[model samples]
Target: GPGSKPFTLPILTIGELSNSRFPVPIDELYTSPNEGVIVQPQNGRSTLDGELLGTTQLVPSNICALRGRINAQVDHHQWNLQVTNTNGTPFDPTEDVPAPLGTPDFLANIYGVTSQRNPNNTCRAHDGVLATWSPKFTPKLGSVILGTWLDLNQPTRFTPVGLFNTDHFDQWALPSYSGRLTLNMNLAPSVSPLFPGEQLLFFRSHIPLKGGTSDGAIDCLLPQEWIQHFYQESAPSPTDVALIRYTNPDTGRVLFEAKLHRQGFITVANSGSRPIVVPPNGYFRFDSWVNQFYSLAPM
Candidate 1:
């Protein structure tokens, strides 16, 4: 058998109590507590160009219990844990009770409201029942997790700093603002899996301009980040492969480029004669990419 030493720390004593006839004395005592260590951050940096950088601090081992307690509390209260089984069915409030006492039955409330249009053509609304139930959960730890009820009766104010202002919209024009460039690709009804109409696939890289900052910097353009691909299946995938390259006009250097392998189904359709139509637009579209460049140097 192994044995460990039992350690004791000094404690302070204060006042004492006296017994009646027996004249016995009682002493007050205090114990010294152990202190925890602090955590610090590691190496971190940011780039002048458009590069992402950050660091995280390491936590002390002794505070593992404290960290766990904090995390548990936040997970239950802040995140409003909704009990869903592996099959995705919500646990019945009456049947499934949480281990800890006073846990909320359901995560939060959902309410519906009608929209009222204002003179300026803005919509707003509110819920009466939600307003009444609001105070019941306001003081609880999970109160922050509660959703808001919209009221449509009130007209949208036209204050200077409000959501929308005619005066600000007219005066606050951004001359440096650049327009967005779109690339539209049409797949053969049988070749494309997207809905007939247009669906945004998001933008990739914008062309770098002369004497520009991070927006169009050569470093900002990377094949990994610039290529925008969609996920769809085809009956028999294409085995052909192709590469698209973007080059800087001034330096004639490859700014960004990518090679797409023609494997897997590029497009698919379940039924219908023209399952996918390339439209009069044919199938492929490209446009100039737009982006604003800003200088962070002190004015």
Candidate 2:
């Protein structure tokens, strides 16, 4: 990853991360002594001019969970040779990195908010998909959301930096930053018959991380109605509460909703509200390209 500090290395700034550009000199176009280089002739007024310079006019706000795709397979031959899958862990000797999975249910590339955002103080390396990195955002004022809270009433703070990351764990985390984490073991989703659909997908859970750095999850009992929508992770980070409105598939209609984080929304279930449902195992998909599921497991 480019140094926590941007531009310390111009060459890296050139090729690292997505959207960075590199100079592709169209040398052949130059010639006629004007070729090799632009000469800033000395003295004699020389029409002399030494060109150079720039600056950062942007000042970031206190906004948290800024999301966007930073890494996509570049045409670079090196990526095909990538031995590590983002977290720096070696690829499974058996499974090729990023196998030809197809227009998958979720993007194969990993994405998220940096646990630590201080100038040069990032706490963890890429943890890759499914294994989130939390607590990395320390209490120091330098870290993003430093000394922050969900509402003026609740002192909730950055739980552990790792609000959520699944499957990649290869492992199982029965309990996590939120509550009981849904196990991916049950169904491979798109690959499984139990769960099926490619229309909607999830990427990350917006439910805030538990108490700062605490390993335990909140599992806060929210009204059954609220979770249906928020449960399906999307927007990667900026989700907290949601009101999902799915036209009763049989009858097409728009189920639109607006929500706030902890403070604004009421936890009480809305009788008039229709909660969304995920067919596979009573669990909504979290942060993915689309809905795809299957793995029969009875709760």
Candidate 3:
């Protein structure tokens, strides 16, 4: 293994811009176009009875391969791009960006609505639908880049870097909670409501038992330098990685922490009945982008 090459993965970047006619916002791309459409499977839902939704479409903007030479070895990669539109709103597919390209793609176009019950109600019954679109690439390194152009609106682009830990796969698959708790940096979001500035951590309170879950207390102490660096940069890139310490409160045991890399998503799990809450009485000095911390309790 003397001349073995280091594993190098591809990095994707997106540029952010003000809303325009050509490059629209990601949310506007999947809006509905109709004004008064009935909801299917009408289940006595009065709010969505006769709502209007906005409509938009996404089209590829750029799709190509990127080749680079690292340590005298040639590495080849490819990606796909799309541009969407509907009047002037924009729609984006961040979840489907890393998906396999060149095949049939789907979209849930949404629309706006107005009602007497809710004054600012912008709900659309059938504003958007799932449509199939193909990329301009093959199976190898299939990358998709979708642009937004709705209602003659342009899109503001931003470079998005995916990051996650890859060492906690076994724990996630199994319900038991014992042994060394590994933190994987590659598993996608395990929970819903994936939004900006979302933070998650993993830990154990006690040693796990056979057929019995583990309940260990865990805490984190991140450096100030790391906090400043992350905030200065709007988003995390493939090059960014972080390391934190995990401590066992009851036994004073120092569990092995991990170096989490950028790109993808990270999921932290605990083996107890309830999640571990931090700064119980709000008496701790908090710094960095993590102002609030919630404990991850097992189901």
Measured by TM-score, the strongest candidate is 3
**Once model 1 is optimally superposed onto the true structure by TM-score, how far is the C-alpha of residue 176 displaced, in angstroms?**
40
lDDT of 2 by residue, 186-280 (tens): 11111101222111111112222322332221111111122222222212322333322222233343332212222112121122212323222
Model 3 stretches with alpha carbons more than 4 Å out? 1-241, 245-259, 264-273, 280-299
Error of 1 at 75 (Å): 19
Candidate 3's TM-score: 0.20
Error of 2 at 201 (Å): 19
**Strongest candidate by lDDT:** 3
What are the runs in model 2 whose C-alpha is more than 4 Å off? 1-138, 143-246, 250-299
What are the per-residue Cα lDDT tens digits for candidate 3 across 1-299? 44422222112111111111111221111111112321111000011111111111122221111111111111122112222222212223332322221122111111111111122443211111111122222112322322222111112122211111112212223111111142212112222112232233322212112222322111111111222223333343323332322344445443423233232112233222334333211111111122113322221
Residues 1-299, candidate 1, lDDT per residue (tens digit)?
Answer: 24432111112111111111011121211111111311110111111121212110111111000000101223222211122221223323233211111111111121222223455766653321111122233211212121222222232111110111111111111111011122111111111223332111111222222222332201111111111111111112222322333333345454333222232111111222221211121212111211112111110
> Against the hidden reference, what TM-scores do the models get?
0.17, 0.16, 0.20
With candidate 2 superimposed using the best TM-score fit, by how many Å does residue 239's alpha carbon deviate from the native?
21
